[PDB]
Swiss-Prot record, chain A:
Belongs to the 2'-deoxynucleoside 5'-phosphate N-hydrolase 1 family. 5-hydroxymethyl-dUMP binds at residues 7, 9-11, 61, 63, 67, 91. The modification Phosphoserine is found at residues 8, 61, 86, 91, 101. Inhibited by AMP and GMP. It comes from the Eukaryota. The gene is DNPH1. It comes from Homo sapiens (Human). This is 5-hydroxymethyl-dUMP N-hydrolase. Expressed at low levels in brain, colon, lung, peripheral blood leukocytes, placenta, small intestine, and thymus. Expressed at high levels in heart, kidney, liver, skeletal muscle and spleen. Overexpressed in a significant proportion of breast cancers. The keyword Nucleotidyltransferase does not apply.
Swiss-Prot record, chain B:
Keywords: Acetylation, Cytoplasm, Glycosidase, Hydrolase, Nucleotide metabolism, Nucleus, Phosphoprotein. The keyword Cytoplasm applies. Monomer and homodimer. Inhibited by AMP and GMP. Expressed at low levels in brain, colon, lung, peripheral blood leukocytes, placenta, small intestine, and thymus. Expressed at high levels in heart, kidney, liver, skeletal muscle and spleen. Overexpressed in a significant proportion of breast cancers. This is 5-hydroxymethyl-dUMP N-hydrolase. The modification Phosphoserine is found at residues 10, 57, 82, 87, 97. The chain holds residues 20 to 162 of 174 of the full protein. GO terms for biological process: allantoin metabolic process; deoxyribonucleoside monophosphate catabolic process; dGMP catabolic process; epithelial cell differentiation; nucleoside salvage; positive regulation of cell growth; purine nucleotide catabolic process.
């Protein structure tokens, strides 16, 4: 299973450790795939190749959202991970895009992410 | 019907009102599961999608991604005077034709929107 993890740039520095925890945990279930035109074409290739797309959606990000819309149009299996303790309110578009099976949105607290990722792929 | 335009920006309030107001001169501006299906219906009906991408937004991102797979004609307007750096995934989605991303200043947005539709009209000019 090629697994695509997408996280924000701001979230890649603020939630840096958390993203690394997600990526290493994902590596137990499959192969983790992860100018501007180059960056774009490459992520798009990875999205099309992915068996599952995993997004951390706590940090509002244009790129992560864009990649989720591209993923939804490719009919990809998607898991979004959102942290309510942050105080943010997840965009109604992302939660509203959930269908509970192919597109799921899980609210979690940072300390249980390994257990939720095991639950998802087990 | 006059053409259908879709405006999307983050959930800067005066700026969005000025953009929607100016867009109404070119056609009908159309703009959790219920919110999602309605926005998707509106993206599919749009002859043109105009997104204000200054503020980071998963929702604005998602709609742009859906608009791209629907092959919608798209204009993204970004304010570099906000302080932010626009995501490489949005600048990178541009191709100069169908998907354009324009850097702008707040006072010229009406003039830029006239420039956008005068160069590629939705409805042609009267003789
Ligand atoms: C190392 C290789 C050459 C490489 C391959 C793919 C990518 C990169 C490097 S990157 O680290 O420069 N960034 C992206 N994607 C990206 C995704 C989102 Cl959601 C963003 O907001 C931004 Cl700015 C970029 N892809
Ligand atoms: C008039 C009716 C009641 C109505 C129709 C469509 C929408 C709404 C109300 S709304 O004001 O609830 N929001 C959206 N879309 C939306 C788009 C983005 Cl990018 C977001 O981040 C969020 Cl949270 C929502 N559509």
């Amino acid at each position: 299973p090629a697994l695509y993890f997408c996280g924000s740039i701001r979230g890649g520095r603020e939630d840096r450790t958390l993203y690394e925890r997600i990526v290493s945990r994902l590596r137990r279930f499959g192969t983790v795939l992860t100018g501007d035109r180059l960056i774009h074409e490459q992520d798009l290739e990875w999205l099309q190749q992915a068996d599952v797309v995993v997004a951390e959606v706590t940090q509002p990000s244009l790129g992560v959202g864009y990649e989720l819309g591209r993923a939804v149009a490719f009919n990809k299996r998607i898991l979004c991970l959102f942290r309510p303790q942050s105080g943010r309110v997840l965009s109604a578009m992302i939660r509203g895009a959930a269908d509970g099976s192919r597109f799921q949105v899980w609210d979690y607290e940072e300390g249980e992410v390994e257990a939720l990722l095991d639950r998802y792929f087990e």
